[PDB]
Design an enzyme around this catalytic site. Structure first.
Site, PDB file in Angstrom:
ATOM      1  N   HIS A  69       0.920  -1.167   0.000  1.00 28.65           N
ATOM      2  CA  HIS A  69       0.000   0.000   0.000  1.00 28.65           C
ATOM      3  C   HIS A  69       0.956   1.212   0.000  1.00 28.65           C
ATOM      4  O   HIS A  69       1.617   1.451   1.036  1.00 28.65           O
ATOM      5  CB  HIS A  69      -0.858   0.074   1.274  1.00 28.65           C
ATOM      6  CG  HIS A  69      -1.948  -0.975   1.150  1.00 28.65           C
ATOM      7  ND1 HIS A  69      -2.364  -1.653   2.260  1.00 28.65           N
ATOM      8  CD2 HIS A  69      -2.667  -1.449   0.116  1.00 28.65           C
ATOM      9  CE1 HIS A  69      -3.313  -2.530   1.917  1.00 28.65           C
ATOM     10  NE2 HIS A  69      -3.533  -2.387   0.603  1.00 28.65           N
ATOM     11  N   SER A  70       1.029   1.922  -1.134  1.00 24.82           N
ATOM     12  CA  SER A  70       2.046   2.967  -1.270  1.00 24.82           C
ATOM     13  C   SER A  70       2.157   4.077  -0.252  1.00 24.82           C
ATOM     14  O   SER A  70       3.279   4.493   0.041  1.00 24.82           O
ATOM     15  CB  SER A  70       2.050   3.463  -2.739  1.00 24.82           C
ATOM     16  OG  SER A  70       0.717   3.767  -3.131  1.00 24.82           O
ATOM     17  N   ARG A  71       1.015   4.532   0.281  1.00 26.05           N
ATOM     18  CA  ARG A  71       1.007   5.639   1.245  1.00 26.05           C
ATOM     19  C   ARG A  71       1.517   5.289   2.652  1.00 26.05           C
ATOM     20  O   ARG A  71       1.672   6.242   3.435  1.00 26.05           O
ATOM     21  CB  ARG A  71      -0.437   6.198   1.399  1.00 26.05           C
ATOM     22  CG  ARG A  71      -1.391   5.151   1.992  1.00 26.05           C
ATOM     23  CD  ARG A  71      -2.751   5.860   2.090  1.00 26.05           C
ATOM     24  NE  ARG A  71      -3.763   4.939   2.625  1.00 26.05           N
ATOM     25  CZ  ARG A  71      -5.048   5.281   2.427  1.00 26.05           C
ATOM     26  NH1 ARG A  71      -5.374   6.388   1.754  1.00 26.05           N
ATOM     27  NH2 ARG A  71      -5.963   4.478   2.967  1.00 26.05           N
ATOM     28  N   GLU A  72       1.731   3.991   2.877  1.00 32.72           N
ATOM     29  CA  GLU A  72       2.220   3.576   4.249  1.00 32.72           C
ATOM     30  C   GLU A  72       3.756   3.727   4.312  1.00 32.72           C
ATOM     31  O   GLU A  72       4.462   2.738   4.519  1.00 32.72           O
ATOM     32  CB  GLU A  72       1.717   2.139   4.462  1.00 32.72           C
ATOM     33  CG  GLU A  72       0.169   2.160   4.498  1.00 32.72           C
ATOM     34  CD  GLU A  72      -0.471   0.801   4.371  1.00 32.72           C
ATOM     35  OE1 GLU A  72       0.140  -0.285   4.534  1.00 32.72           O
ATOM     36  OE2 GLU A  72      -1.671   0.792   4.090  1.00 32.72           O
ATOM     37  N   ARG A 127      -3.064   4.641  -2.358  1.00 31.12           N
ATOM     38  CA  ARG A 127      -2.645   3.343  -1.804  1.00 31.12           C
ATOM     39  C   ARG A 127      -2.615   2.208  -2.844  1.00 31.12           C
ATOM     40  O   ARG A 127      -1.936   1.189  -2.583  1.00 31.12           O
ATOM     41  CB  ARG A 127      -3.596   2.911  -0.662  1.00 31.12           C
ATOM     42  CG  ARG A 127      -4.922   2.477  -1.294  1.00 31.12           C
ATOM     43  CD  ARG A 127      -6.018   2.520  -0.252  1.00 31.12           C
ATOM     44  NE  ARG A 127      -5.744   1.605   0.843  1.00 31.12           N
ATOM     45  CZ  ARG A 127      -6.096   0.344   1.025  1.00 31.12           C
ATOM     46  NH1 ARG A 127      -6.816  -0.273   0.113  1.00 31.12           N
ATOM     47  NH2 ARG A 127      -5.739  -0.314   2.130  1.00 31.12           N
ATOM     48  N   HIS A 196       2.635  -3.460   6.907  1.00 28.60           N
ATOM     49  CA  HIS A 196       1.736  -2.331   6.562  1.00 28.60           C
ATOM     50  C   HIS A 196       1.660  -1.295   7.671  1.00 28.60           C
ATOM     51  O   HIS A 196       2.349  -1.501   8.702  1.00 28.60           O
ATOM     52  CB  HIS A 196       0.304  -2.982   6.584  1.00 28.60           C
ATOM     53  CG  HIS A 196       0.079  -3.878   5.407  1.00 28.60           C
ATOM     54  ND1 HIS A 196      -0.647  -3.425   4.318  1.00 28.60           N
ATOM     55  CD2 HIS A 196       0.494  -5.119   5.090  1.00 28.60           C
ATOM     56  CE1 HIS A 196      -0.718  -4.374   3.401  1.00 28.60           C
ATOM     57  NE2 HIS A 196       0.032  -5.417   3.830  1.00 28.60           N
ATOM     58  N   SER A 197       0.845  -0.262   7.520  1.00 26.70           N
ATOM     59  CA  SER A 197       0.627   0.669   8.642  1.00 26.70           C
ATOM     60  C   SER A 197      -0.791   1.219   8.342  1.00 26.70           C
ATOM     61  O   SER A 197      -1.219   1.099   7.185  1.00 26.70           O
ATOM     62  CB  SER A 197       1.639   1.801   8.795  1.00 26.70           C
ATOM     63  OG  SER A 197       1.403   2.819   7.794  1.00 26.70           O
ATOM     64  N   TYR A 248     -11.906  -7.136  10.593  1.00 23.39           N
ATOM     65  CA  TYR A 248     -13.111  -7.558   9.903  1.00 23.39           C
ATOM     66  C   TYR A 248     -12.765  -8.432   8.702  1.00 23.39           C
ATOM     67  O   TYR A 248     -11.590  -8.563   8.406  1.00 23.39           O
ATOM     68  CB  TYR A 248     -13.658  -6.224   9.299  1.00 23.39           C
ATOM     69  CG  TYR A 248     -15.098  -6.338   8.885  1.00 23.39           C
ATOM     70  CD1 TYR A 248     -16.098  -6.468   9.853  1.00 23.39           C
ATOM     71  CD2 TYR A 248     -15.460  -6.305   7.532  1.00 23.39           C
ATOM     72  CE1 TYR A 248     -17.431  -6.558   9.465  1.00 23.39           C
ATOM     73  CE2 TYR A 248     -16.789  -6.392   7.142  1.00 23.39           C
ATOM     74  CZ  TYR A 248     -17.771  -6.515   8.118  1.00 23.39           C
ATOM     75  OH  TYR A 248     -19.105  -6.604   7.765  1.00 23.39           O
ATOM     76  N   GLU A 270       0.755  -4.340  11.246  1.00 17.86           N
ATOM     77  CA  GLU A 270       0.219  -3.002  10.956  1.00 17.86           C
ATOM     78  C   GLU A 270       1.016  -2.118  11.941  1.00 17.86           C
ATOM     79  O   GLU A 270       0.759  -2.233  13.139  1.00 17.86           O
ATOM     80  CB  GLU A 270      -1.275  -2.882  11.142  1.00 17.86           C
ATOM     81  CG  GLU A 270      -2.077  -3.559  10.051  1.00 17.86           C
ATOM     82  CD  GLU A 270      -2.174  -2.659   8.796  1.00 17.86           C
ATOM     83  OE1 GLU A 270      -1.686  -1.507   8.813  1.00 17.86           O
ATOM     84  OE2 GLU A 270      -2.712  -3.206   7.806  1.00 17.86           O
TER      85      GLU A 270
END
Ligand code: ZN
Length: 307
Positions: A69-72, A127, A196-197, A248, A270
């Site tokens: 996910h690029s924005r993390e 992302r 991830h974050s 979820y 995360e």
């Protein structure tokens, strides 16, 4: 940076700086690290994996991917710090030395290079990948919903404009298929970790089904031990459990796929924080985050070597 020793680990970098860093590291530790190109992104950028090994032939291995996910941004930053740390600790840290003397580590720092370049050029919060959809004006796929593990089931969107779009079919994204082919071809991966974050969670399978994995007791105990280790440095608190019970339902995720391939030690992290800064974590938190995350990762690698 003219040396990995002059690279600034306490700041966020561009794609070119990270790719240059890779070459510096290989140049400095030719006997321990090699750079492999496992594919090309949708926009033609090379997809690189660093392989850390002390020899042998197809030793049991550990896969670690960051930045899907690029924005993390905290994840690519942690990935560069990890690469350097491996080279520093081999021959210093008895535990880490034991691990590299018997196993290989494959590290993919920038899993989604096109999205990363986009976060620097046009939209910091992008992302997805940058693949162009047929019958859509919308671009990209959530690469962590594109794996062949409950693909297309609930917990993913079939709308191209969705931030959680799963894509046309399982493994449609070259960034994902490149990993799938490599891991299947290797056939000796024992652990698969995807970073991830944000939210401070350590999760194990599954996200696509309520079914409990056969190795739940063991993975749960490993997760508890890893979170205890990570907390030890700065007191950072993580929660752990299966994806579906913790968050979820989410379909097409990478650790559901890897586990179904027989790679038992499949976990997703995360990273920090819990929402104060979210995706825009201050550069000042890069090293502390990397440092504590390493303890959690090392814990899992130790169990892996033993089990
Ligand atoms: Zn993510």
């Amino acid at each position: 940076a003219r040396s990995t020793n002059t690279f600034n680990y306490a700041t966020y970098h561009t794609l070119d700086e990270i790719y240059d860093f890779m070459d510096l590291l290989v140049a400095e530790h030719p006997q321990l690290v090699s750079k492999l190109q496992i594919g090309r992104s949708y926009e033609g950028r090379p997809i690189y994996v660093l392989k850390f090994s002390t020899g042998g032939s197809n030793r049991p291995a550990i896969w670690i991917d960051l930045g899907i996910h690029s924005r993390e941004w905290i994840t690519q930053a942690t990935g560069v710090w990890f690469a350097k740390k491996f080279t520093e600790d081999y021959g210093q840290d008895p535990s880490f030395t034991a691990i590299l003397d018997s196993m290989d580590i494959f590290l993919e720092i920038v899993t989604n290079p096109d999205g990363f370049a986009f976060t620097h050029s046009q939209n910091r919060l992008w992302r997805k990948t940058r693949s162009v959809t047929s019958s859509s004006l919308c671009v990209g796929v959530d690469a962590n919903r594109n794996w062949d593990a409950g693909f297309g089931k609930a917990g993913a969107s079939s709308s191209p404009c969705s931030e959680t779009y799963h894509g046309k079919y399982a493994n449609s994204e070259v960034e994902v298929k490149s990993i799938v082919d490599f891991v299947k071809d290797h056939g000796n991966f024992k652990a698969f970790l995807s970073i991830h974050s944000y939210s401070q969670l350590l999760l194990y399978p599954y996200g696509y089904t309520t079914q409990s994995i056969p190795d739940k007791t063991e993975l749960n105990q490993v997760a508890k031990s890893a979170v205890e280790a990570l907390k030890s440095l700065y007191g950072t608190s993580y929660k752990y459990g299966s994806i579906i019970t913790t968050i979820y339902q989410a379909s097409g995720g990478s650790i559901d796929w890897s586990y179904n391939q027989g790679i038992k030690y499949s976990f997703t992290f995360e990273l920090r924080d819990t929402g104060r800064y979210g995706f825009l974590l201050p550069a000042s938190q890069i090293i502390p985050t990397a440092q504590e995350t390493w303890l959690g990762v090392l814990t899992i690698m130790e169990h892996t070597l033993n089990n």
